Structure 1
Amino acid sequence: ASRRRAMKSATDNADDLIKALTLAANRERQAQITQEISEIVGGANALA
């Protein structure tokens, strides 16, 4: 019984961890796109 409870708790903890990690990964992905565009447009403006 306690193993069932502990594994339910660990599965919920893994759910929360995956959610938080996915949010962090999406934030990092958006930030990377923004920074790449920033560098590209900065270079383009410098050339202009």
Structure 2
Amino acid sequence: ASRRRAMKSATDNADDLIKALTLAANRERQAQITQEISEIVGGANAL
């Protein structure tokens, strides 16, 4: 009964970790794309 309760807790903590990491991987994806564009259009403006 404690293994049930504690493994329900560990599942809800692993889901709140998947959420927080998915939000971080999205912010990093968007920053990587934004940065890559900023470098490309900077090299187009320099020419």
TM-score after normalising by structure 1: 0.96
TM-score (norm 2): 0.98
Which deviations, in whole Å up to 9, do the C-alpha atoms of 1:2-43 show, x marking residues without a partner?
A: 000000000000000000000000000000110000000000
Q: Percent identity?
A: 100
CA distance in 2, matches of 1:39, 1:13: 38
Query: Gapped runs of 5+ residues in structure 1?
Result: none
Q: Which runs of at least 4 in structure 1 moved beyond 6 Å after TM superposition?
A: none
- Which ranges in structure 2 are unaligned for 5 or more consecutive residues? none
Report the equivalent of 2:43: 43
Distance in 1, matches of 2:9 and 2:34, equals: 38
Q: Considering only aligned residues, what root-mean-square deviation do their CA atoms show, in Å?
A: 0.3
